[PDB]
Amino acid sequence: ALLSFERKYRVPGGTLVGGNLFDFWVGPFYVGFFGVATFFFAALGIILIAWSAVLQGTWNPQLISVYPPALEYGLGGAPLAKGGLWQIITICATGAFVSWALREVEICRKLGIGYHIPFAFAFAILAYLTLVLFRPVMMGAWGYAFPYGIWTHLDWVSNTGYTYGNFHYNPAHMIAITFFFTNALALALHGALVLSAANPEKGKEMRTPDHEDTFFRDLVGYSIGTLGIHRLGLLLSLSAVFFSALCMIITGTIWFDQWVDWWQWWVKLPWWANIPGGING
């Protein structure tokens, strides 16, 4: 079925591969070549997940956990039950994530719109590969990657973090957090501002974008604009993820001690390093 306004947009063309072989829809979903690829990768990764659950001995989704190979395996292949499945599932996940992005690109072309959405999605993929590929490789073992389990992969975060004391002190970790908080702050303000203008007080006409500007100038003396806030929201969310991949690719690769020790270059500058008093004196 279609939206009342959808038909005039369902024209042929825009594909990158296969011409018109896969240029069709299944219900609302556009297929395309990479839609078929996505389905094939996804269907495989899911089967291997079910196969790992059989080897594990449980069909409870809260207990299923596919672990990577043991550190002793280095960066080599492992048997299916001893990390191999994690390795193949990681390949399928990557295939599905990348196929998903290229499918979005085919949809951008058929609709004559920009490629911002798949470009932003690639940052999320970058973060995933930072944890399962880039960092493990640089450290020299797949085992450093995280396990595919609902709760076991929270344990990995905890174990990895506390290996370096309090991960809070990772300076790149602070920056990424600041963007995450600021992003949610900006998202709440933006959604609230549009709704407040489209849904004003009772007995009032719809407000205008000028009211939005005026509200924020009255509140904090500056309005970024209707275009600027969407540029900002895109930037805040991508930077957050960017510094997240950054704060991990340096952990265990170029930094090995507790992150609180990184802040001593400031404390122990030879001039004020000895002045008695204070916290460090």
Binding site: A1, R7, K8, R10, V11, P12, T208, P209, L227
Partner: protein
């Protein structure tokens, strides 16, 4: 059975209702779903259509009630390519001229968008007292080059979003003396020229024209922007 268990259970119930509510709110446009022949589709999903809400538009422009009887209010020059559903509908003539596909436009009101005071939101800079180029390259006077590396005209003015102090269109003078509007987001201002990758030089004349030299309506904006974006797909044969 402790207070924590009841809190997390109560929340999941609250969240289910919230999602239900959010989905129906996002069904005020484009529903009910239609078959590819325009008739109502049998399966409309589990979520019902929301109850109408009314916006009172400012400046006496009436009221909008959504959801309401939908209408394209324009001909669609497409045709089925398959008995079964889910296949492309092919243009029957010139898609850029017929405004289909990436060249589509919507039948918005043939009126200009207004600012908070009731004045035209967008205006040519020659009619905007006090506005000027404050940073970057001033495109006025520069030649406009199409994807065929030929010159279609020269920039003669900039249409400015006054409340937001933003350039939205370039007014380009064609070889024949007339002008067209080019979306600011589809041009590249360079040192010596303005490059438009979306259109070839001989497709600028095909851009829809406006009725008034000092205002542009919402309908004309959709027609102009649709045409230019449609060039990416339909002007590609002569893109060097």
């Amino acid at each position: 059975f402790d207070l924590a268990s009841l809190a997390i259970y109560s929340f999941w119930i609250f969240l289910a209702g919230l999602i239900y509510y959010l989905q129906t709110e996002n069904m005020r446009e484009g529903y009910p779903l239609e078959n590819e022949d325009g008739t109502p589709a049998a399966n409309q999903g589990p979520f019902p259509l929301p109850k109408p809400k009314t916006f009172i538009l400012p400046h006496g422009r009436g009221t909008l009630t959504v959801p309401g009887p939908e209408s394209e209010d324009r001909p669609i020059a497409l045709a089925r390519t398959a008995v079964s559903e889910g296949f492309p509908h092919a243009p029957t003539g010139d898609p850029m001229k017929d405004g289909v596909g990436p060249a589509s436009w919507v039948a918005r009101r043939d009126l200009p968008e207004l600012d908070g005071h009731g004045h035209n939101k967008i205006k040519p800079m020659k009619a905007a007292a006090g506005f000027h180029v404050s940073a970057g390259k001033n495109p006025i006077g520069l030649p406009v080059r199409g994807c065929d590396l030929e010159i279609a005209g020269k920039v003669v003015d900039i249409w400015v979003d006054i409340p937001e102090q933003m350039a939205r269109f370039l007014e380009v003078e064609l070889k024949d003396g007339s002008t067209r509007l080019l979306p600011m987001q589809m041009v590249k201002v360079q040192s010596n020229r303005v490059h438009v990758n979306a259109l070839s030089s001989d497709l600028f004349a095909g851009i829809p024209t406006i009725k008034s030299p000092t205002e542009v309506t919402l309908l004309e904006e959709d027609k102009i922007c649709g045409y230019v974006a449609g060039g990416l797909m339909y002007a590609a044969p002569k893109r060097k």
